[PDB]
Symmetry: none
Subunit: 32 residues, 18 copies
């Protein structure tokens, strides 16, 4: 029982979130 690459983003309870972008390789992003 062992993990290697643990990629968790916002993996939990949340109330209000605006503008969520997840990407190892990205570009040109505008969060209004």
């Amino acid at each position: 029982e062992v993990h290697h690459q643990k990629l968790v983003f916002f993996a939990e309870d949340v109330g209000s979130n605006k503008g969520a972008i997840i990407g190892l390789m990205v570009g040109g992003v505008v969060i209004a």
Copy 2:
């Protein structure tokens, strides 16, 4: 089941989420 690679994004209870884009390779991402 989670083994070695775990790619999760906002995997849980949420109240109000606006704009959720997940991608390893992407471009030009705008959120209102």
Copy 3:
């Protein structure tokens, strides 16, 4: 041969979800 890769997005008791997408290879994305 066993696979140890896992990929997923938001998935649970959500209240107000507006604007969601998942893509390993995709460009040009706009959310309202």
Copy 4:
């Protein structure tokens, strides 16, 4: 076995959130 990559972002309870972007490599990001 000396490979252990832990990537946890916003992995917890939160109230309000505005502007969330994650990516090992990116280019050009604006937060409102």
Copy 5:
């Protein structure tokens, strides 16, 4: 409880967050 590369960001109880960008190799970033 041993980990080689540990990457923890905003991983805890938070009230209100505004402008959060995580990226080992980022460029041209602005937070309002």
Copy 6:
């Protein structure tokens, strides 16, 4: 101790956070 790399940023009870960026190789950051 151990020959490992641990990175932590904002991992505790937080109230109001404005302007947060993490990048070992960042260039041009405007935290308003």
Copy 7:
């Protein structure tokens, strides 16, 4: 005769935080 790379920034109770940038190699940085 030991060794370890520890990097902890802001890991406790915080109230009003304005301007947070972490990175070994950072160029052109400005906070308000």
Copy 8:
């Protein structure tokens, strides 16, 4: 002058924090 590296900045209860930058190599920094 050789041993483990313990990099710790601001690891306690704090009220207000204005202009916080952490990084060995930093060029051109305007902390307003």
Copy 9:
């Protein structure tokens, strides 16, 4: 002068902080 690379800065309770930059190589730094 010490031997171990213990870089500890502000590791206790603090009220209000105005301009805080931690790093070995620093150039063109202005605090308000």
Copy 10:
């Protein structure tokens, strides 16, 4: 609008190619 995302692994005039695998999200890869 659509951004510009290129993903090239190899080019013409290869010659002797022995072992070439490409995968944005893949696990377990052994090449002779």
Copy 11:
């Protein structure tokens, strides 16, 4: 190269293409 996503695995005049696999998502891969 263009205003879109272009994933190039191989090109002409390859000569000897031994061991070629392309998959956006897949686990367990063995090639001679």
Copy 12:
């Protein structure tokens, strides 16, 4: 402002290549 993302593992006029693996988010690779 203009932003683009270009990823290239190799180029033309290679000659002889043995053992090539590319993956944005993978785990467990061995080359002979």
Copy 13:
């Protein structure tokens, strides 16, 4: 043309290349 983020691993006229592993986030790589 102009480009912001460009991940170049190798170039033309490489000649002989043995053992090439390219990946943003991984864990567990071995080359003969």
Copy 14:
């Protein structure tokens, strides 16, 4: 021609290269 984020591991006229690994957030790497 504004190469903001340019990550080059190798250039042209390589000749002979044995054992090459590139990764922003990787771990557990071994080369013969």
Copy 15:
């Protein structure tokens, strides 16, 4: 705004190279 993130591990006219490891945030690396 002014900035530029340029990183190069090797240049033209290489010739002979063995054991190459490039990574901003990595750990546990052994080269023969």
Copy 16:
């Protein structure tokens, strides 16, 4: 103001190189 970030490891006219590791933040590096 004008600020930039450059990071060069090796230059042209190399010839022969054995054992090269580059990383702003690495833990546990052993070369033969």
Copy 17:
């Protein structure tokens, strides 16, 4: 009033280079 931050490990005309490592912060380095 600062120009910029630039770091160079080795220049051109290196010839025969054996055992080389670079990193703003490293823990546990050994060269044969």
Copy 18:
């Protein structure tokens, strides 16, 4: 302090190098 930032480990015309380690905050460095 308010001045150009140019860190150079070694210059051109190296010739024969063996065990070259560079880094602001190093730890457990041993050269054979």
